Design brief:
Blueprint (H helix, E strand, L loop, with lengths): L1 H16 L4 H15 L8 H5 L6 H13 L3 H8 L1 H9 L7 H9 L5 H6 L6 H8 L1 H5 L2 E2 H18 L4 E5 L1 H4 L3 E2 L2 E6 L13 H11 L3 E7 L3 E6 L13 E7 L5 H9 L2 H12 L3 E3 L4 E3 L15 H7 L13
Parallel strand pairs: 4-7
Antiparallel strand pairs: 1-3, 2-4, 5-6, 6-7, 8-9
Bound molecules: manganese (II) ion (MN) (3 copies) and sodium ion (NA) (3 copies).
The site of one manganese (II) ion has 6 residues, from loops.
It binds 3 DNA strands through helix 2, helix 4, helix 7, strand 5 and helix 14.
DNA sequence: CCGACGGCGCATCAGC
DNA sequence: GCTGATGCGCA
DNA sequence: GTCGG
Protein backbone atom coordinates (compact mmCIF):
# COMPACT_ATOMS: atom_id res chain seq x y z
CA UNK A 1 0.00 0.00 0.00
CA UNK A 2 2.85 2.34 -0.85
CA UNK A 3 0.60 4.70 -2.80
CA UNK A 4 -1.58 5.24 0.26
CA UNK A 5 1.21 5.53 2.87
CA UNK A 6 3.13 7.97 0.68
CA UNK A 7 -0.03 10.10 0.51
CA UNK A 8 -0.57 10.03 4.30
CA UNK A 9 3.09 10.88 4.87
CA UNK A 10 2.96 13.90 2.54
CA UNK A 11 -0.21 15.03 4.37
CA UNK A 12 1.64 14.56 7.69
CA UNK A 13 4.51 16.77 6.53
CA UNK A 14 2.13 19.53 5.51
CA UNK A 15 0.35 19.52 8.86
CA UNK A 16 3.70 19.67 10.68
CA UNK A 17 5.55 22.11 8.41
CA UNK A 18 2.80 24.44 7.21
CA UNK A 19 -0.27 24.09 9.46
CA UNK A 20 1.95 23.64 12.54
CA UNK A 21 -0.54 21.04 13.78
CA UNK A 22 1.73 18.53 15.45
CA UNK A 23 -1.09 16.21 16.53
CA UNK A 24 -2.49 15.93 13.03
CA UNK A 25 1.07 15.24 11.84
CA UNK A 26 1.22 12.39 14.35
CA UNK A 27 -2.27 11.26 13.41
CA UNK A 28 -1.26 10.87 9.77
CA UNK A 29 1.96 9.05 10.65
CA UNK A 30 0.07 6.75 12.98
CA UNK A 31 -2.31 5.94 10.10
CA UNK A 32 0.54 5.47 7.62
CA UNK A 33 2.27 3.13 10.05
CA UNK A 34 -0.70 0.87 10.71
CA UNK A 35 -1.42 0.70 6.98
CA UNK A 36 2.19 -0.26 6.10
CA UNK A 37 1.82 -3.15 8.61
CA UNK A 38 -1.43 -4.35 6.97
CA UNK A 39 -0.69 -7.57 5.00
CA UNK A 40 -3.45 -7.06 2.43
CA UNK A 41 -3.78 -4.77 -0.59
CA UNK A 42 -6.32 -2.15 0.54
CA UNK A 43 -9.36 -2.17 -1.77
CA UNK A 44 -11.38 0.62 -0.12
CA UNK A 45 -11.56 3.30 2.57
CA UNK A 46 -13.93 1.16 4.63
CA UNK A 47 -11.30 -1.61 4.54
CA UNK A 48 -8.66 0.83 5.93
CA UNK A 49 -11.28 2.19 8.33
CA UNK A 50 -11.18 -1.08 10.29
CA UNK A 51 -7.59 -0.29 11.30
CA UNK A 52 -7.00 1.71 14.54
CA UNK A 53 -5.68 5.20 13.73
CA UNK A 54 -7.58 5.26 10.44
CA UNK A 55 -10.79 7.29 10.75
CA UNK A 56 -13.61 8.89 8.78
CA UNK A 57 -11.56 11.59 7.05
CA UNK A 58 -8.69 9.26 6.12
CA UNK A 59 -11.03 6.56 4.76
CA UNK A 60 -12.56 9.17 2.43
CA UNK A 61 -9.12 10.32 1.30
CA UNK A 62 -8.33 6.68 0.64
CA UNK A 63 -11.51 6.26 -1.44
CA UNK A 64 -10.49 9.29 -3.52
CA UNK A 65 -6.88 8.21 -4.04
CA UNK A 66 -8.01 4.65 -4.92
CA UNK A 67 -10.52 6.05 -7.47
CA UNK A 68 -8.54 8.86 -9.08
CA UNK A 69 -4.97 7.83 -8.30
CA UNK A 70 -4.41 11.26 -6.73
CA UNK A 71 -5.70 13.56 -3.97
CA UNK A 72 -7.07 17.03 -4.76
CA UNK A 73 -6.07 18.40 -1.33
CA UNK A 74 -2.42 17.48 -2.03
CA UNK A 75 -2.61 18.92 -5.55
CA UNK A 76 -3.76 22.32 -4.28
CA UNK A 77 -1.08 22.30 -1.57
CA UNK A 78 1.70 21.45 -4.04
CA UNK A 79 0.36 24.28 -6.23
CA UNK A 80 0.34 26.71 -3.31
CA UNK A 81 3.44 28.88 -3.32
CA UNK A 82 3.60 29.65 0.40
CA UNK A 83 2.81 26.09 1.42
CA UNK A 84 5.24 24.56 -1.11
CA UNK A 85 8.07 26.89 -0.18
CA UNK A 86 7.63 26.49 3.60
CA UNK A 87 7.57 22.70 3.09
CA UNK A 88 10.71 22.92 1.04
CA UNK A 89 12.71 25.06 3.42
CA UNK A 90 12.05 22.74 6.36
CA UNK A 91 14.20 20.17 4.54
CA UNK A 92 17.20 22.19 5.74
CA UNK A 93 18.46 20.90 9.09
CA UNK A 94 17.82 23.70 11.60
CA UNK A 95 14.97 25.29 9.70
CA UNK A 96 11.72 24.27 11.31
CA UNK A 97 8.13 25.36 10.63
CA UNK A 98 8.60 28.75 12.31
CA UNK A 99 11.89 29.74 10.62
CA UNK A 100 10.61 28.42 7.28
CA UNK A 101 7.49 30.53 7.56
CA UNK A 102 9.44 33.67 8.50
CA UNK A 103 11.89 33.24 5.65
CA UNK A 104 9.06 32.80 3.13
CA UNK A 105 7.27 35.90 4.46
CA UNK A 106 10.50 37.78 3.68
CA UNK A 107 10.66 36.36 0.15
CA UNK A 108 13.27 33.72 1.02
CA UNK A 109 12.05 30.41 -0.45
CA UNK A 110 14.87 28.58 -2.29
CA UNK A 111 18.30 27.17 -1.53
CA UNK A 112 19.62 30.14 -3.54
CA UNK A 113 17.77 32.71 -1.47
CA UNK A 114 19.28 30.96 1.57
CA UNK A 115 22.74 31.33 -0.05
CA UNK A 116 22.08 35.01 -0.77
CA UNK A 117 20.99 35.57 2.85
CA UNK A 118 23.56 33.51 4.78
CA UNK A 119 23.78 36.38 7.30
CA UNK A 120 20.23 35.56 8.42
CA UNK A 121 21.08 31.90 9.11
CA UNK A 122 22.30 30.64 12.49
CA UNK A 123 25.20 28.21 12.76
CA UNK A 124 23.08 25.04 12.66
CA UNK A 125 21.16 26.36 9.64
CA UNK A 126 24.34 27.28 7.71
CA UNK A 127 25.57 23.77 8.30
CA UNK A 128 22.28 22.28 7.07
CA UNK A 129 22.43 24.47 3.96
CA UNK A 130 26.09 23.54 3.37
CA UNK A 131 25.20 19.85 3.52
CA UNK A 132 21.71 20.01 2.09
CA UNK A 133 22.14 17.29 -0.49
CA UNK A 134 24.42 15.16 1.64
CA UNK A 135 21.94 15.01 4.54
CA UNK A 136 19.16 13.72 2.27
CA UNK A 137 21.27 10.78 1.04
CA UNK A 138 20.83 7.45 2.86
CA UNK A 139 23.91 5.75 4.34
CA UNK A 140 24.61 2.23 2.96
CA UNK A 141 24.97 -0.45 5.66
CA UNK A 142 28.53 -1.10 4.41
CA UNK A 143 29.59 2.44 5.35
CA UNK A 144 27.61 2.30 8.59
CA UNK A 145 29.83 -0.68 9.47
CA UNK A 146 32.98 1.29 8.61
CA UNK A 147 31.65 4.21 10.65
CA UNK A 148 30.95 1.85 13.54
CA UNK A 149 34.53 0.53 13.56
CA UNK A 150 35.98 4.07 13.65
CA UNK A 151 33.73 5.24 16.49
CA UNK A 152 34.20 2.06 18.59
CA UNK A 153 38.00 2.23 18.18
CA UNK A 154 38.50 5.95 18.82
CA UNK A 155 36.32 5.55 21.91
CA UNK A 156 38.72 2.77 23.03
CA UNK A 157 41.66 5.17 22.58
CA UNK A 158 40.18 7.70 25.04
CA UNK A 159 39.39 5.02 27.60
CA UNK A 160 38.86 1.27 27.40
CA UNK A 161 35.98 1.09 29.90
CA UNK A 162 33.68 3.21 27.68
CA UNK A 163 30.95 1.26 25.91
CA UNK A 164 29.66 2.78 22.67
CA UNK A 165 26.70 1.13 20.92
CA UNK A 166 25.35 2.12 17.49
CA UNK A 167 21.55 2.01 17.79
CA UNK A 168 18.71 3.38 15.67
CA UNK A 169 17.94 1.97 12.22
CA UNK A 170 21.42 0.35 12.08
CA UNK A 171 20.72 -1.77 15.16
CA UNK A 172 17.34 -2.76 13.68
CA UNK A 173 19.56 -4.03 10.84
CA UNK A 174 18.39 -1.84 7.95
CA UNK A 175 20.41 -1.85 4.71
CA UNK A 176 20.74 1.93 4.80
CA UNK A 177 20.41 4.53 7.52
CA UNK A 178 19.34 8.14 7.73
CA UNK A 179 22.22 8.91 10.13
CA UNK A 180 24.42 7.42 12.92
CA UNK A 181 23.15 7.25 16.53
CA UNK A 182 25.60 6.32 19.25
CA UNK A 183 24.88 5.54 22.89
CA UNK A 184 27.84 6.06 25.21
CA UNK A 185 28.34 4.78 28.77
CA UNK A 186 31.21 4.77 31.25
CA UNK A 187 31.57 3.15 34.68
CA UNK A 188 32.14 6.53 36.38
CA UNK A 189 28.74 7.88 35.30
CA UNK A 190 25.59 6.44 36.86
CA UNK A 191 22.26 7.75 38.15
CA UNK A 192 24.16 9.15 41.18
CA UNK A 193 27.88 9.59 40.49
CA UNK A 194 28.73 13.21 41.46
CA UNK A 195 28.55 14.31 37.79
CA UNK A 196 31.70 13.30 35.89
CA UNK A 197 33.12 16.19 33.78
CA UNK A 198 34.11 16.06 30.10
CA UNK A 199 33.08 12.41 29.70
CA UNK A 200 31.39 13.19 26.37
CA UNK A 201 33.73 16.02 25.44
CA UNK A 202 36.73 13.66 25.53
CA UNK A 203 35.11 11.37 22.98
CA UNK A 204 33.85 14.22 20.75
CA UNK A 205 37.30 15.80 20.89
CA UNK A 206 39.10 12.59 19.89
CA UNK A 207 36.69 11.99 16.99
CA UNK A 208 37.44 15.54 15.86
CA UNK A 209 41.16 14.87 16.27
CA UNK A 210 41.06 11.97 13.80
CA UNK A 211 38.92 14.23 11.52
CA UNK A 212 35.92 11.88 11.64
CA UNK A 213 33.68 14.60 13.08
CA UNK A 214 33.72 17.75 10.95
CA UNK A 215 31.00 19.97 12.37
CA UNK A 216 29.09 20.56 15.59
CA UNK A 217 25.35 21.38 15.59
CA UNK A 218 24.93 21.31 19.34
CA UNK A 219 27.09 19.98 22.14
CA UNK A 220 26.56 19.58 25.85
CA UNK A 221 27.40 17.26 28.70
CA UNK A 222 25.03 14.45 27.70
CA UNK A 223 24.16 15.05 24.05
CA UNK A 224 26.20 15.75 20.91
CA UNK A 225 24.69 16.48 17.50
CA UNK A 226 27.01 16.96 14.55
CA UNK A 227 28.44 15.96 11.21
CA UNK A 228 30.94 13.23 10.37
CA UNK A 229 32.57 11.76 7.27
CA UNK A 230 34.50 8.60 6.38
CA UNK A 231 38.13 9.14 5.32
CA UNK A 232 38.63 8.98 1.53
CA UNK A 233 41.42 7.23 -0.45
CA UNK A 234 44.09 9.03 -2.51
CA UNK A 235 42.30 10.90 -5.29
CA UNK A 236 38.90 9.30 -4.64
CA UNK A 237 35.34 10.54 -4.34
CA UNK A 238 34.80 12.12 -0.94
CA UNK A 239 32.20 10.19 1.04
CA UNK A 240 29.07 12.31 1.70
CA UNK A 241 29.01 14.13 5.08
CA UNK A 242 26.71 12.32 7.58
CA UNK A 243 24.62 13.28 10.57
CA UNK A 244 25.80 11.79 13.83
CA UNK A 245 24.19 11.90 17.27
CA UNK A 246 25.95 10.81 20.44
CA UNK A 247 24.15 10.44 23.77
CA UNK A 248 25.91 9.80 27.06
CA UNK A 249 23.66 7.95 29.49
CA UNK A 250 24.11 6.74 33.07
CA UNK A 251 25.39 3.16 32.97
CA UNK A 252 22.65 1.75 35.19
CA UNK A 253 20.12 2.92 32.59
CA UNK A 254 21.85 1.56 29.51
CA UNK A 255 19.10 -0.91 28.59
CA UNK A 256 16.19 1.54 28.70
CA UNK A 257 18.46 3.79 26.65
CA UNK A 258 19.38 1.13 24.10
CA UNK A 259 15.71 0.15 23.86
CA UNK A 260 14.58 3.72 23.23
CA UNK A 261 17.32 4.80 20.85
CA UNK A 262 17.07 1.70 18.80
CA UNK A 263 13.44 2.70 18.08
CA UNK A 264 11.60 2.94 16.00
CA UNK A 265 10.11 6.35 16.81
CA UNK A 266 6.61 4.98 16.20
CA UNK A 267 7.54 1.81 18.04
CA UNK A 268 8.59 3.69 21.21
CA UNK A 269 5.40 5.78 20.96
CA UNK A 270 3.60 2.40 20.77
CA UNK A 271 5.55 0.96 23.73
CA UNK A 272 4.83 3.87 26.11
CA UNK A 273 1.07 3.78 25.45
CA UNK A 274 0.88 0.01 25.98
CA UNK A 275 3.08 0.52 29.05
CA UNK A 276 0.35 2.62 30.70
CA UNK A 277 -2.03 -0.03 29.38
CA UNK A 278 -0.32 -2.29 31.93
CA UNK A 279 0.40 -0.03 34.90
CA UNK A 280 3.90 0.99 33.80
CA UNK A 281 5.41 4.17 32.44
CA UNK A 282 8.46 3.96 30.19
CA UNK A 283 10.85 6.70 29.24
CA UNK A 284 14.34 6.79 27.79
CA UNK A 285 15.84 6.22 31.22
CA UNK A 286 13.66 3.93 33.33
CA UNK A 287 10.61 1.71 33.59
CA UNK A 288 8.39 2.48 36.59
CA UNK A 289 4.94 1.39 37.75
CA UNK A 290 2.09 3.73 38.58
CA UNK A 291 -0.34 2.64 41.29
CA UNK A 292 -4.09 3.18 41.47
CA UNK A 293 -4.14 6.96 41.19
CA UNK A 294 -1.20 7.15 38.81
CA UNK A 295 2.05 8.72 39.90
CA UNK A 296 5.04 6.58 38.92
CA UNK A 297 6.97 4.67 41.60
CA UNK A 298 10.70 3.98 41.60
CA UNK A 299 12.73 2.63 38.64
CA UNK A 300 12.39 -1.15 38.49
CA UNK A 301 15.64 -3.13 38.01
CA UNK A 302 16.62 -3.85 34.42
CA UNK A 303 19.53 -5.84 32.97
CA UNK A 304 18.25 -6.50 29.45
CA UNK A 305 15.86 -5.06 26.89
CA UNK A 306 13.63 -8.12 27.32
CA UNK A 307 13.47 -7.43 31.06
CA UNK A 308 11.52 -4.36 29.98
CA UNK A 309 9.34 -6.41 27.58
CA UNK A 310 8.50 -8.87 30.40
CA UNK A 311 7.14 -6.17 32.74
CA UNK A 312 4.51 -4.94 30.22
CA UNK A 313 3.70 -8.36 28.73
CA UNK A 314 4.81 -8.13 25.13
CA UNK A 315 6.47 -11.00 23.34
CA UNK A 316 10.06 -9.83 22.83
CA UNK A 317 10.73 -8.41 19.38
CA UNK A 318 14.31 -8.36 18.11
CA UNK A 319 15.66 -4.94 16.98
CA UNK A 320 14.71 -5.84 13.41
CA UNK A 321 11.03 -6.12 14.38
CA UNK A 322 10.69 -2.55 15.68
CA UNK A 323 10.66 -0.68 12.36
CA UNK A 324 7.28 1.04 12.64
C1' DC B 1 -18.63 16.45 22.02
C1' DC B 2 -14.49 16.70 23.85
C1' DG B 3 -9.65 16.48 25.16
C1' DA B 4 -5.23 13.87 25.14
C1' DC B 5 -1.80 12.80 21.80
C1' DG B 6 5.80 12.80 25.54
C1' DG B 7 8.94 15.50 26.96
C1' DC B 8 13.85 17.09 27.16
C1' DG B 9 18.81 18.98 25.94
C1' DC B 10 20.82 22.65 23.76
C1' DA B 11 21.01 27.27 20.93
C1' DT B 12 19.26 31.42 20.02
C1' DC B 13 17.52 36.02 20.81
C1' DA B 14 13.67 39.82 22.14
C1' DG B 15 12.82 42.35 25.52
C1' DC B 16 14.39 44.36 29.29
C1' DG C 1 24.78 42.13 29.37
C1' DC C 2 21.26 38.70 31.11
C1' DT C 3 17.54 35.51 30.92
C1' DG C 4 12.75 33.82 30.00
C1' DA C 5 10.65 32.35 25.85
C1' DT C 6 10.72 29.70 22.13
C1' DG C 7 12.48 26.93 18.32
C1' DC C 8 14.61 22.75 16.75
C1' DG C 9 15.46 17.90 16.33
C1' DC C 10 14.74 13.78 18.04
C1' DA C 11 14.37 7.31 18.84
C1' DG D 1 -7.43 13.33 12.81
C1' DT D 2 -8.66 9.67 15.87
C1' DC D 3 -10.39 7.35 19.52
C1' DG D 4 -11.64 6.34 24.38
C1' DG D 5 -13.95 8.62 27.88
MN1 LIG E 1 -6.46 -10.52 7.27
MN1 LIG F 1 19.16 7.37 13.07
MN1 LIG G 1 19.59 10.50 15.02
NA1 LIG H 1 -10.19 2.81 12.42
NA1 LIG I 1 14.42 21.31 9.00
NA1 LIG J 1 15.57 10.07 10.26
Amino acid sequence: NGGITDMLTELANFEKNVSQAIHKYNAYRKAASVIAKYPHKIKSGAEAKKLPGVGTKIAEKIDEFLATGKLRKLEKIRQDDTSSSINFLTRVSGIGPSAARKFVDEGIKTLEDLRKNEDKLNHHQRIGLKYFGDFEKRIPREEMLQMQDIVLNEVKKVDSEYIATVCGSFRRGAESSGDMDVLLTHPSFTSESTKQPKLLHQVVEQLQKVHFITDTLSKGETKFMGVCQLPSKNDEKEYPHRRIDIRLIPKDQYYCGVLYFTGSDIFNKNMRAHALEKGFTINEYTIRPLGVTGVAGEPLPVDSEKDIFDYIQWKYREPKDRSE
